[PDB]
């Protein structure tokens, strides 16, 4: 009630934090062949949501795996290969992970400014009539 | 006369609207990256009229979206938030001086 | 933030895809009865307001 801006800016901070964690996992598991062909790691992405029934908070609605086909590689030497000597690798694209890293960091720090400036307006309100 | 309405003026309703606008502007900034979210605008004249005695406006994008569907121009949102904070500070100074002058007259100090 | 980050990212990602397409042709120089694949770029405007 007295801190509506904080609940929205703070929600963005928590929302953008999850997207950076997801990006870190995608880049750290870009070369994890693992085993089989369906347990292989796939690029994960958070889903943001806004319920507009004032302020509309941003809520993460779960992590969703990418629909891109797995990157196939011919390697009849890896013991975890298949009949045709193929090892399927995660469908992680480095260029899109770099862009998400730039977008997440900048958007996260933008909400810091709004939340920090929101406190100043509250502090100035207490000085009304003084 | 001699009433708080006739003394404070519209500086009491304006403060509430300026805080309402900051809530709307901050929402657009937070929801900038959410795909499909449409930027929300607020009419100050209509809101001030409603506050004095007592609908959804959307902001037309300057350029097409890149596919997500979000029409939040973060360059404009920061500029409007900066302007809203300055005008809100003036309104607090305007409203704060109304009470100080009233106290000054009722006490002769 | 400016949507030009993703506009340039989407072009850089596609340039990698065309690079991989040309790479398969060079990996298949000695292949028998192999028809080289052609690669090009298409411009698709983002129609809408603005």
């Amino acid at each position: 009630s007295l801190f509506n801006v904080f609940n929205v800016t703070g929600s963005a901070m928590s929302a953008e934090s999850v997207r950076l964690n997801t990006t870190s996992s995608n880049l750290a598991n870009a070369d994890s062949v693992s085993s089989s062909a369906k347990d292989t790691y796939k690029a994960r992405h958070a889903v943001f949501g806004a319920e507009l029934s004032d302020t509309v908070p941003v809520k993460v609605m779960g992590i969703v795996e990418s629909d891109k086909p797995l990157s196939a590689e011919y390697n009849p030497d890896h013991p975890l290969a298949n009949e045709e000597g193929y090892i399927y690798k995660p469908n992680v694209n480095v260029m899109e992970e770099m862009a998400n890293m730039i977008s997440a960091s900048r958007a996260y720090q933008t909400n810091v400014q709004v939340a920090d400036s929101s406190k100043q307006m509250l502090l100035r309100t207490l000085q009304m009539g003084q | 006369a001699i009433s708080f309405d006739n003394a404070l003026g519209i500086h009491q309703h304006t403060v509430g609207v300026r805080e309402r606008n900051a809530e709307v502007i901050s929402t657009n900034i937070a929801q900038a990256n959410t795909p499909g979210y449409k930027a929300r605008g607020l009419d100050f004249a209509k809101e001030l009229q409603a506050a004095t005695s007592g609908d959804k406006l959307y902001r037309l994008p300057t350029q097409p979206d890149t596919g997500d569907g979000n029409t939040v121009d973060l360059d404009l949102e920061r500029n409007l938030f900066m302007q809203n904070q300055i005008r809100h500070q003036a309104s607090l100074d305007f409203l704060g001086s109304k009470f100080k002058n009233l106290t000054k007259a009722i006490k002769g100090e | 933030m400016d949507r030009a980050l993703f506009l340039a990212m989407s072009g850089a990602k596609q340039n990698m895809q065309a690079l991989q397409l040309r790479a398969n042709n060079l990996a298949n120089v000695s292949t028998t009865g192999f028809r080289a694949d052609l690669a090009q770029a298409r411009s698709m405007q983002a129609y809408g307001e603005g």
């Binding site: 507009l52 | 997500d68 | 989407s10």
Partner: peptide, 25 residues
């Protein structure tokens, strides 16, 4: 009524790329 989708690079490219799952889009 909600407005949900994957933010970032996966949604800011033409739908012909088909990276977002159909259900999410």
């Amino acid at each position: 009524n909600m407005v949900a989708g994957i933010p970032g690079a996966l949604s800011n490219q033409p739908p012909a790329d088909a990276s977002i799952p159909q259900d999410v889009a």
